[PDB]
Amino acid sequence: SMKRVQPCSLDPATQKLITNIFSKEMFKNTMALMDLDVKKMPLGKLSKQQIARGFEALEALEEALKDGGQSLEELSSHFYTVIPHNFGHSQPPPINSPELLQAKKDMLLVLADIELAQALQAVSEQEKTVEEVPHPLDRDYQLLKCQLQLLDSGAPEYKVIQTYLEQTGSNHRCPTLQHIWKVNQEGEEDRFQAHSKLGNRKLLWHGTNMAVVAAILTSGLRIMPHSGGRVGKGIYFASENSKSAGYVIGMKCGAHHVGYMFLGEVALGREHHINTDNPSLKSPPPGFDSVIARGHTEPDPTQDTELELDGQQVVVPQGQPVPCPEFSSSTFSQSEYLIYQESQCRLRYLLEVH
Ligand SMILES: C[C@H](NC(=O)CCc1nc2ccccc2c(=O)[nH]1)c1ccccn1
């Protein structure tokens, strides 16, 4: 007996979002862009065990890169058996530098979130027994356990967000704003309230691959054991959209290019400012609640405004980037804002940009 498929409750923009972030073609494209062999690693075959084994292989490479152990070649080969790569059916190359090691760790962190999205979609037994099912897009939305509310252009914060995007995005080829959703992942509310005493809150950009958007909506921005970069093992944000936009892996759809970007509220508290890379950081120095790798520029602070989110003032930059003489010799062209506790960020908005 045929189950009834109930009509979709979602508006068109939301249906498109949900289609995009769970799209098998998107996920496979992402795996291709990371040099993975999708024929040998289909989406349905991806497992938590394999990803675990991949990290163990990288852990061994990291120890060798830092005594008669296996060579980097041998240790690479193991990694490529565990995580099949496609390089024109030539031999994949050896992971013999800290840069390439972090690149592979980052690839696996993406792949882990792809596997999360597949595991999220497994059909439950409650679903097999009920006689009516939600529309596939309603089902996928409900799986996120995340409220998304589409904003119209007269919403109080809409202009402020658009101005942030426009003023701090690329000057020549700015991303074009298509939609904004307010994001309310509950489960986030309470840990974030923990930092209510922490003044210095700012709304900051976080760009990602489209393949990790579902994972973020389900679980927030995360720090994992192999997370890394120029400012160590934290969650990275930018005050300049153009900086975060560099991490947006968009996807060709029709004649346009679709990308998604988050705005998070970050409780920065007492800021420690640095002007040189430190990939070894795992927390701010004692007494500090965040690390800001200060750029040569910063959105002009005289133009900052504020939005009231859950009764707290949150700074939102509105200015074009201006030079900061004190940091003119920084190793950072643009600032990177780091937190080292997941609880210091609350997702607030999701933007679709073309
Ligand atoms: C490795 C990848 N990281 C990201 O997607 C964050 C990308 C990012 N990096 C930044 C660095 C400096 C300033 C801004 C950004 C940013 O907006 N996104 C990831 C994916 C899935 C789980 C954990 N990490």
Q: Which of these, 143, 141, 162, lies nearest to 151 by C-alpha position?
A: 162
Among protein residues, the one whose CA lies closest to atom 6 of ligand 1: 208
Please list, in sequence order, all residues whose beta carbon lies within 8 angstroms of the beta carbon of residue 188, skipping any fewer than 6 positions away.
220, 346, 347
Helix (H) or strand (E) holding 264: strand 256-267
C-alpha to C-alpha distance for 30 and 21, rounded to whole angstroms: 12
Q: Out of 124, 144, 164, pick the residue that ends a domain.
A: 144
Which residue blocks in the chain are alpha helix, DSSP H?
12-21, 24-33, 48-65, 72-82, 98-120, 125-129, 136-143, 158-168, 188-193, 213-219, 241-245
Please list, in sequence order, all residues whose beta carbon lies within 8 angstroms of the beta carbon of residue 66, skipping any fewer than 6 positions away.
none
Q: Are residues 33 and 127 in the same domain?
A: yes
Apex CA 304: angle with CA 303 and CA 305, to 5°? 115
Task: Go through the chain and list every residue after which a break occurs, taking a C to next N gap over 2.5 angstroms, comma-separated.
Answer: 66
Sign of CA dihedral 20, 21, 24, 27: positive
Q: Are residues 150 and 139 in the same domain?
A: no
Please list, in sequence order, all residues whose beta carbon lies within 8 angstroms of the beta carbon of residue 191, skipping any fewer than 6 positions away.
342, 343
Q: Which residue has the tokens 């045929």?
A: 2
Q: Are residues 217 and 84 in the same domain?
A: no
DSSP letters of 272-327?
Answer: EEESS--TT-SSPPTT-SEEEE-BSEEE-GGG-EEEEETTEEEEE--SPEEE-GGG
Number of domains within the chain: 2
CATH code for the domain in which residue 219 is found: 3.90.228.10
Residue 216 three-state SS: helix
CA-to-CA separations, 31 to 38, 189, 268, 303, in angstroms, rounded: 7, 33, 34, 41
Other C-beta atoms lying within 10 Å of the C-beta of residue 67: 4
Q: How much distance in Å is there from the Cα of 155 to the middle of ligand 1?
A: 28
Q: Are residues 217 and 267 in the same domain?
A: yes
Q: Which residue has the tokens 């509220």?
A: 265
Among protein residues, the one whose CA lies closest to atom 18 of ligand 1: 207
Q: What's the reported resolution, in angstroms, to a tenth?
A: 1.9
* Structure-solving method: X-ray
Residue 217 three-state SS: helix
Residue 258 three-state SS: strand
Tell the burial category of 274 from Cβ atoms under 10 Å away from its Cβ (0-12, 13-18, 19+): buried
Sign of CA dihedral 18, 19, 20, 22: positive
Q: Are residues 70 and 87 in the same domain?
A: yes
Q: Are residues 113 and 235 in the same domain?
A: no
Ligand 1 pocket residue status of 106, Cβ below 6 Å? yes
Q: Say if CB 133 and CB 4 are below 8 A apart.
A: yes
Query: Which residues span the domain enclosing 222?
Result: 145-354
Q: Are residues 331 and 317 in the same domain?
A: yes
Ligand 1 pocket residue status of 206, Cβ below 6 Å? yes
Q: Are residues 119 and 11 in the same domain?
A: yes
Q: Are residues 92 and 223 in the same domain?
A: no
CATH code for the domain in which residue 106 is found: 1.20.142.10
Q: Out of 99, 125, 144, pick the residue that ends a domain.
A: 144
Q: How much distance in Å is there from the Cα of 236 to the middle of ligand 1?
A: 6
User: What Rg, from alpha-carbon coordinates, does the chain have?
Assistant: 21
Residue 4 three-state SS: strand
Q: Are residues 155 and 173 in the same domain?
A: yes
Q: Are residues 139 and 169 in the same domain?
A: no
Q: Out of 97, 119, 144, pick the residue that ends a domain.
A: 144
C-alpha to C-alpha distance for 132 and 127, rounded to whole angstroms: 9
Phi, psi of 292 (to 5 degrees): -115, 115
Q: How much distance in Å is there from the Cα of 53 to the middle of ligand 1?
A: 22
Q: Are residues 333 and 294 in the same domain?
A: yes
Ligand 1 pocket residue status of 113, Cβ below 6 Å? yes
